C-alpha cells in the first residue's frame, strides 16, 4: 500500500522531471555549435614517459602548480613526479598496496591515497624531518576508496564503493558531511572550481550534483546506460562530463539539468575509465579500455585525436591547471605526458 | 644547477629503492581469495578492509588477499586483481542451493576482460559435508542440477580410497560443472585447477604452490615465445 503509493509518486515525479527537461530542450548543442569551425586533427605527442611504477597505475592527480603530479600504482607506491624533468620527488610506501585513487592537495603540502583498505590516508610532503609519514588515516567508509579530492589542507571529500561520498576533516579525522543517494558504487568525484559543489559518477548509471555545505544531492543526471567510472567538471563549473562503461562520454549541464552531448563512435565498444577537459573545455579527453585516449571535440562530438601510446588499460587521465599538458597513466605501469 | 643535481640524485636514490622493492615484490606471489560466506575460504591454508594471508611453500612467498569490508557488488574492485598470479576460488561444494551462484560467479570471473588471463585455483571445499549429504540421500543434486541424472563419472577420475561411488560422481559432477565454464572460453590464456578439499586438509598450501608453479611456467612460456 504505502510502498506502491511511494513508487507511483516517484514514477510521476520522474515523468515530471523528464517532461521539464524536454521542455527546456528547445535546441540541441549540435544546432547551437553547428556554425563554429571544427578544431581539426589534434595530434598530441608523448613528451615525457614517467617510468618507475612496477605495477599497474590506478590513478594520478596533477598538483595545482601544474608541474608536480602524484601517481597511484598497485605496487604499493605513491610517486610524486617532477613532470618537467621526470624526477621522482617522493616515493611513499603504502600500507595497503591496493590503492585505487590519489589526490594532490592544492597547497602541494599533502597527498592522499586509498582503495581496498577503505581508508583515505593523508601523507604530508613537507615534514620537518624530511621524510613522508602518514599524517592522517581517514577510516569510516564501509567500501573501497574510489576517488578523493582535497578541498584544502584540512578538508578532503572522498567517494567510495559503499555508495556514499564523504567530506572529511583531516585534523579530527571525522566525517563532517556524508553524501548519500547513489544506489551503486561511486567511482569518481569532480570538484567544482568554486569548491561549493561536486559531481559524483556512480555504478547506478547516474551522476549526482551535491552541495558540499548543505550536504544533499541537488541534481541527479541520468542518461548513461552503464556504470559511470569517470566524472569531470567543465572549467566554468556550470557543466560536467561523465565517462561510463557504455562506451560513451556524456556532457551534462547543471543549469539545464540534462545531457547536452554524447561522445561515442560505433567502433568504440570499450568503457571509459577517465575523463578530463582542456583549459577552455573545448577538448574532452577520455581514457578508454582499448588502451587509447580519444580527444573529443566537446562542442561538435567529433573525435579530434587519439593518444595511442599505451600497451594496457588507460586507468587515469589528468590535465594541468594551466592547460599545458595531459598526463595519461595506464595499466602498463607508465605515465605519459602529452601536448 | 646544484639543486637540480640534488633533485636528480634524490630521484636516482628513489629509483634504487623502487628497484629493490620491486625485486622484493616480484618474488611474492599475489593471490586473490574468493568465495561465498559458507565456502570456508578462511580456513583453506589455515595460517578491517582487505585481509591478507601470508604463507610460504618451498621458499616461495604467497600473499593471499581475502577482500572483506566490501559490498556484494564486485565488478569494480575485482579489476584491482588483474595482475594476480591466481584467483583462489573456494566453493562450498555441499551447498547445492548455492552451487549455481558459485558457478555464475566463476563464469563472471572467467569471462571478465580484466580477469580472463588469470588462472583460477578452484577449491571445492567441504568435501566431507558433500559426502555425508550424498550418503544421507535427503538432498538430491538432480533437484538442483537435472543433468546430474545423465552424468557419469569420468574415466580420468581418481576416487579416494574407501569413497562411495555416488560421492565420487557428485564431487566430479560439481568439478565438471565448473570445468565446463572453464573450457568454454579462454583456452590457452588461463587454466582452472580443481581440488577436492575438506576443512581438515593441510596440503592446500602445497596444492596452491603446485598450481601457481604451473601458472608461472605457462606465463614464462608465453614470455619465451614457446607458448
Amino acid at each position: 500500500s504505502e510502498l506502491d503509493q511511494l513508487r507511483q509518486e516517484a514514477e510521476q515525479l520522474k515523468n515530471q522531471i523528464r517532461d521539464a527537461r524536454k521542455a527546456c530542450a528547445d535546441a540541441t548543442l549540435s544546432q547551437i555549435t553547428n556554425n563554429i569551425d571544427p578544431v581539426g586533427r589534434i595530434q598530441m605527442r608523448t613528451r615525457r614517459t614517467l617510468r618507475g611504477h612496477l605495477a599497474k597505475i590506478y590513478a594520478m592527480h596533477w598538483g595545482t602548480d601544474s608541474r608536480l603530479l602524484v601517481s597511484a600504482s598497485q605496487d604499493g607506491k605513491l610517486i610524486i613526479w617532477d613532470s618537467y624533468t621526470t624526477n621522482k620527488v617522493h616515493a611513499i610506501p603504502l600500507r595497503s598496496s591496493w590503492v585505487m585513487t590519489c589526490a594532490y592537495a592544492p597547497s602541494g603540502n599533502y597527498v592522499a591515497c586509498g582503495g581496498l583498505d577503505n581508508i583515505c590516508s593523508i601523507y604530508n610532503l613537507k615534514t620537518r624531518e624530511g621524510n613522508v609519514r602518514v599524517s592522517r588515516e581517514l577510516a569510516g567508509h564501509t567500501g573501497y576508496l574510489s576517488c578523493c579530492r582535497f578541498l584544502d589542507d584540512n578538508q578532503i571529500v572522498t567517494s567510495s564503493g559503499d555508495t556514499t561520498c564523504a567530506l572529511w576533516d583531516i585534523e579530527t579525522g571525522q566525517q563532517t558531511t556524508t553524501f548519500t543517494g547513489h544506489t551503486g558504487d561511486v567511482m569518481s568525484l569532480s570538484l567544482a572550481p568554486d569548491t561549493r559543489l561536486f559531481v559524483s559518477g556512480a555504478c547506478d548509471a547516474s551522476a549526482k550534483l551535491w552541495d558540499v555545505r548543505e550536504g544533499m544531492c541537488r541534481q541527479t543526471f541520468t542518461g548513461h546506460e552503464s556504470d559511470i567510472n569517470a566524472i569531470c567538471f567543465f572549467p566554468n563549473g556550470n557543466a560536467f562530463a561523465t565517462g561510463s562503461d557504455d562506451a560513451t562520454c556524456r556532457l551534462f549541464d547543471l543549469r539545464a539539468d540534462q545531457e547536452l552531448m554524447t561522445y561515442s563512435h560505433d567502433n568504440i565498444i570499450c568503457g571509459i575509465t577517465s575523463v578530463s577537459f582542456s583549459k577552455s573545455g573545448r577538448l574532452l579527453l577520455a581514457g578508454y579500455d582499448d588502451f587509447n585516449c580519444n580527444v573529443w571535440d566537446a562542442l561538435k562530438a567529433d573525435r579530434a585525436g587519439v593518444l595511442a601510446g599505451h600497451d594496457n588499460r588507460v586507468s587515469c587521465l589528468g590535465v594541468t591547471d594551466d592547460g599545458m599538458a595531459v598526463a595519461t597513466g595506464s595499466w602498463d605501469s607508465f605515465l605519459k605526458i602529452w601536448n | 644547477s646544484a639543486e637540480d643535481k640534488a633533485a636528480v640524485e634524490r630521484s636516482k636514490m628513489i629509483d634504487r629503492n623502487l628497484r629493490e622493492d620491486g625485486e622484493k615484490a616480484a618474488r611474492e606471489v599475489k593471490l586473490l581469495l574468493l568465495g561465498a560466506d559458507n565456502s570456508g575460504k578462511s580456513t583453506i591454508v589455515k595460517q578491517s578492509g582487505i585481509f591478507e594471508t601470508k604463507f610460504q611453500v618451498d621458499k616461495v612467498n604467497f600473499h593471499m588477499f581475502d577482500v572483506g569490508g566490501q559490498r556484494d557488488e564486485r565488478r569494480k574492485w575485482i579489476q584491482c586483481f588483474n595482475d594476480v598470479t591466481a584467483i583462489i576460488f573456494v566453493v562450498d561444494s555441499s551447498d547445492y542451493n548455492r552451487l549455481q551462484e558459485a558457478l555464475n560467479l566463476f563464469k563472471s570471473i572467467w569471462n571478465n576482460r580484466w580477469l580472463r588471463t588469470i588462472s583460477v585455483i578452484l577449491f571445492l571445499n567441504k568435501q566431507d559435508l558433500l559426502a555425508e549429504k550424498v550418503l544421507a540421500g535427503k538432498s538430491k543434486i538432480e533437484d538442483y542440477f537435472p543433468e546430474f541424472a545423465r552424468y557419469t563419472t569420468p574415466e580420468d577420475a581418481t576416487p579416494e580410497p574407501g569413497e562411495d561411488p555416488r560421492v565420487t560422481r557428485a564431487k566430479y559432477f560439481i568439478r565438471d560443472e565448473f570445468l565446463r565454464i572453464s573450457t568454454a572460453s579462454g583456452d590457452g590464456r588461463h587454466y582452472c585447477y580443481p581440488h577436492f578439499t575438506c576443512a581438515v586438509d593441510t596440503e592446500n598450501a602445497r596444492r596452491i604452490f603446485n598450481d601457481v608453479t604451473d601458472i608461472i611456467i605457462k606465463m614464462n612460456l608465453r614470455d619465451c615465445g614457446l607458448f
Partner: nanobody
Amino acid sequence: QVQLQESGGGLVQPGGSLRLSCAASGFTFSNYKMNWVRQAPGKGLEWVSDISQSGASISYTGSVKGRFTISRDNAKNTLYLQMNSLKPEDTAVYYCARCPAPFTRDCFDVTSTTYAYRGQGTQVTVSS
C-alpha cells in the same frame, strides 16, 4: 535513465503457466545480456536464467530447466520469461536484471542486494 519494468506476475495454481514480461528503456537493449533473478521469501537473490545479446546463448538455473523459457525481443526492447509447470518453490519476486556493461560475456552483481540495473520486480505467487 536505465529503467526495467516487469509485469505478468500474479497468483497462479501449481502446475500453471505465467509469462513474465519486462519493458526495458533507457539503454540499447540488444547490447546487453539479460537476466531473470528470483527473491524467494526468506532467501537471497537467486539467478534464474540469462539470454545473450543476440539471443543465441541461453542458460537456466537447474531448478527451472525445461520449465522456464527466456526470450528477448530486441526490436521491442522486451525480455520474456515463459514460466510453465510452476511449482510452489517458484513463488518469489521475479526481477529482470540487466548485465552491468555492454558487449560482455561476464555478468557481475545481478544478484546483489542493491543492484542498480534491476527492476522493481513482479511478485509471482504459486499456490492453491
